Amino acid sequence: CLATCAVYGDGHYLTFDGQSYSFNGDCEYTLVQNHCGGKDSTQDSFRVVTENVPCGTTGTTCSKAIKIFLGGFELKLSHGKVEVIGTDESQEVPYTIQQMGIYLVVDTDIGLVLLWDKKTSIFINLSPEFKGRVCGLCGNFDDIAVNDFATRSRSVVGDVLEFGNSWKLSPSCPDALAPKDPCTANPFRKSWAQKQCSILHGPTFAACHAHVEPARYYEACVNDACACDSGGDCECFCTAVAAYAQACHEVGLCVSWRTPSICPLFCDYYNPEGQCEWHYQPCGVPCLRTCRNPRGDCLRDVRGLEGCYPKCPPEAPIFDEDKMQCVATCP
Amino acid sequence: CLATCAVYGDGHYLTFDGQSYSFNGDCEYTLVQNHCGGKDSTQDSFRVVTENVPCGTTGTTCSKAIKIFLGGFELKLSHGKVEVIGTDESQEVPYTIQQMGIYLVVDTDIGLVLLWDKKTSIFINLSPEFKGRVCGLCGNFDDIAVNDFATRSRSVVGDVLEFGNSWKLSPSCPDALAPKDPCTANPFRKSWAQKQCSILHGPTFAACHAHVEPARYYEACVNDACACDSGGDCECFCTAVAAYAQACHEVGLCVSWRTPSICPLFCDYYNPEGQCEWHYQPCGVPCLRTCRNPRGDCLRDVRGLEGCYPKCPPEAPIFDEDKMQCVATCP
Ligand SMILES: [Ca+2]
Ligand SMILES: [Ca+2]
């Protein structure tokens, strides 16, 4: 299969091999890099970087915008939209923008796909052909967890703070420091945080409990809820729960955890007047007939997307994907 | 028409005549009382009381449960459910429980109807025949705003704190004090609070701006968002916005303010598998054919309810109102 590097919440990271760590810093860092040391192995260089800003009062940092550089093309992901800056007249545009469920998906011919929740999280999937050829925060794709702490010089350092700060992009940006305990800083929020995050240990995720241990995700939920004290704590809780749900869906199990009282969705909003063709799919539709993807072609490469999806009627089965309405014929 | 006494948020009150004031207290208080001084004017006594608990750290108090006493019948409204305690074998049950939209509606033959949002708010509508015969926090229904501060002894006192504390139900409960400024107490939340509550001054409520001045509601939204720092600030903001929306709907204007990113609803959750018969009605359906209310009878006495409503198909047009599904025939 394809390994996944996941970044979400307040500095929560998961390497391709499987190593997990927490690191926060008000700077710009590189997640995945190509051709480390300038070794152009007959492949175009691709680089993914992230920008972190201090959110909250404890000192935690959360991702704000993501910049993608590949083949001379620069893309900006901020405020829930895509902005193109670096344009190359020659060659051909290698990225395709597609909105599926609640995630923004970008596909590249080189084999790199990214999933964006448009608020804080980001998921990276890499083709197996790039094994042992990438460097960055996600670590080398050598399937070895212990040696994922290379500090930009092919040297493993046990200090997670030093490893994280070695990949900073701005030389003038300040060095990171050891974070404090958000729950200790804000004791009065601990009860509400525990009550909200107890759903992870509830019967809803009983099936996924055996496959994936939720202790780390539960701790992340508690810490984020404790720290998300600057407004919109519901967003922090929903992002943590959605990250755990996506992790569960990656294995293959499907869980329908969303309720009208817990992180609700408004699929009916997109429904046109007098018609109802939108529903919430927890597993997600495998393949949908669109103008860009006809009925014959499905392209079910990525699985694990959730959100509102249009259920076109037997008449006009193909979805426009541009006007947000079922169309009889795609031009 | 019928005057409305509205209680919502952190001690926000609106008298029947129109007087507005703010008062918070960790005690039990009587909203509307009947037969003041024991004057049984050939009418059964009805009494509505509320219980307030300290929510947050600033010191603000919000309603938790509501108890209704009338004709020897006692009802409890807590945890989003109705519990019956006082049961009278003789006579007949005078209250009917009906769930419409997002509000819980109780109807009485005497002419008293209450709307409950199940979280913090409560709306009281009184028949004009009870003019000048009721006492309590809502004040006498004499259509005079200046003399609404009777301190349980037919004496008007300019001290709002004294007027509020004169109606306490527990003699041993402590006296209330002057509240502080939540935004001053929590300065870092002011920017987010203002950004969220700025929707009131936006173009969405332009039509209602002329009829109703939103300055008081804007201040209430800002104060509640500043004080709602113990978790679930989104609930506080949504309750304030919904209170303003109900106030707008009382005049007659209809506003569709809910968006998937601002206080969303999950009407699709109640939809059975393979069927879609639920939609969000901002104005609210005037009358719906139910088992208790057939097609011939509409009973459009109360207007201004919003939430998810079932749109039954031409087949099985009457709604069950008990099994949450359209039924062909009501037994
Ligand atoms: Ca490694
Ligand atoms: Ca009066």
Numbering used by the authors:
A (entry chain A), B (entry chain B): 899 to 1229
Sentences from the paper on this structure:
The rs36189285 SNP corresponds to Arg996Gln, while rs878913005 corresponds to Arg1201Trp, both substituting the for MUC5AC typical arginines. The Arg996Gln mutation, located in VWD3 β9, is placed directly in the interface between the VWD3 and the TIL3 domain. The substitution results in a slight reduction of the distance between the two domains. No interactions involving this residue are observed in the WT or in Arg996Gln, but considering the resolution limitations a hydrogen bond between Arg996 or Gln996 and a TIL3 β1-β2 loop residue cannot be completely ruled out. Only when 2D templates from WT open conformation were used for particle picking, these could be detected in the Arg996Gln sample. The ratio in Arg996Gln dataset, 98:2, illustrates the important reduction in open conformation particles from 17% in the WT to only 2%. The open conformation was not detected in the D’D3CysD1 Arg99Gln cryoEM preparation during standard particle picking. Only template picking based on the WT open structure revealed a few particles. This observation, together with the described reduction of the distance between VWD3 and TIL3 domains, suggests that this mutation stabilizes the closed conformation and reduces the steric repulsion between Arg996 and TIL3. The mutation Arg996Gln, frequent in Asian population, affects the distance and the dynamics between the TIL3 domain and the VWD3, directly interfering in the conformational change and oligomerization.
The two gel-forming mucins MUC5AC and MUC5B constitute the main structural components of the mucus protecting the underlying epithelia in the respiratory system. The VWD assemblies are formed by the VWD domain, C8, trypsin inhibitor like (TIL) and E domains, except the VWD’ domain that only has the TIL and E domains. We determined the cryoEM structures of the wild type D3 assembly of the human MUC5AC mucin and the structural single nucleotide polymorphisms (SNP) variants Arg996Gln and Arg1201Trp that affect intermolecular interactions. The D3 assembly forms covalent dimers that can appear in two alternative conformations, open and closed, where the closed conformation dimers interact through an arginine-rich loop in the TIL3 domain to form tetramers.
